[PDB]
Amino acid sequence: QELYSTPASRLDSFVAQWLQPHREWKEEVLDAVRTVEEFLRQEHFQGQDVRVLKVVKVGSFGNGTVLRSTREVELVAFLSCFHSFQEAAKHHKDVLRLIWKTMWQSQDLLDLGLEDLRMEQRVPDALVFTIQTRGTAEPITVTIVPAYRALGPSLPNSQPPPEVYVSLIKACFCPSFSELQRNFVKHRPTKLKSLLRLVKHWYQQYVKARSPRANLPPLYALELLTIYAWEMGTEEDENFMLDEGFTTVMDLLLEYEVICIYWTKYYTLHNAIIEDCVRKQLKKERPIILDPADPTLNVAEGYRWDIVAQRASQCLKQDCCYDNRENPISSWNV
């Protein structure tokens, strides 16, 4: 069975039965990742004496959208030796090499079958490796990106002080705000997570897999578009029709040339400098999907939305976007 041959009326069952990972498998993976997290927090890295002050899971394991097919766990490490955005940028690779050097001597990680260490140019660079789980000894890929801790402790989803974004804009994808990128997707209703899984699965299997060399947009852009569709289309209803949501996202993808989306979730227009930044962003070539966590980033800029629209057009012709009386599923209003 696959998505395109799944009737719209059966999408809830498809997501639940085909796309959800087994809960014990997820726990197996997180148990192994915990050892990496503990290593990072506890190790006195010998650069000065360097510490990872905080480690956060991001991407699918961080925001609750892990799929059956997910085989990577993404971590962001906040470093003691970065005191500005500029310092993090300058010493990003230095820190990854330091962490890598030290991992090869870690009895704990060696006992988890650590292998395949390399740096990958993931914009920004990531240290990438595999470890083996404790039960099955199955391999899982783990990635680490270093960050300047620009934000202090607070409730999930409070607003950063405007001065943080003023400094960002003065300083000239920003892992300093990765907790916010996480939270924006994580702190949503269960059924929205099902729609996110569905869209991500579709994107990976029918778009990314088919054009693996193309400059396709990041999954985050698709997450933001999906959230937008739901927020506007249902007035943030925890109860909604999954099939209508999926069709709505496909329709929106067709219209990429006129998409202009932003939020004042983590920044508002009250600060003149932030307002000026956002105003400037919104006048640029569309699609614009402004990062709710970072007013300087149009997450959609520069990517092959033309390819995505081509696949969305095909998707809309499939059983997953038709009812059982051969009527197209109707999309939400905005």
Author numbering: 5 to 51, 57 to 181, 187 to 348
The paper states:
The 350 N-terminal residues of OASL have 39% amino acid identity with OAS1 and are known as the OAS-like domain (OLD). Recently it was discovered that the UbLD of OASL could substitute for K63-linked pUb and interact with the CARDs of RIG-I. OASL thereby enhances RIG-I signaling leading to an amplified antiviral response.
We expressed the OLD (42 kDa) in E. coli and purified it to ∼95% homogeneity by immobilized metal affinity chromatography, affinity chromatography and size exclusion chromatography. Crystallization conditions for the OLD were established using standard commercial screens and the optimized crystals diffracted to 1.6 Å. Phases were determined by molecular replacement using the structure of porcine OAS1 as a search model. Likewise, two loop regions spanning the residues 52–56 and 182–186 did not display well-defined electron density. The N-terminal lobe harbors the five-stranded β-sheet found in all polymerases. The C-terminal lobe is a four-helix bundle with a three-stranded mixed β-sheet with an additional interstrand α-helix connection.
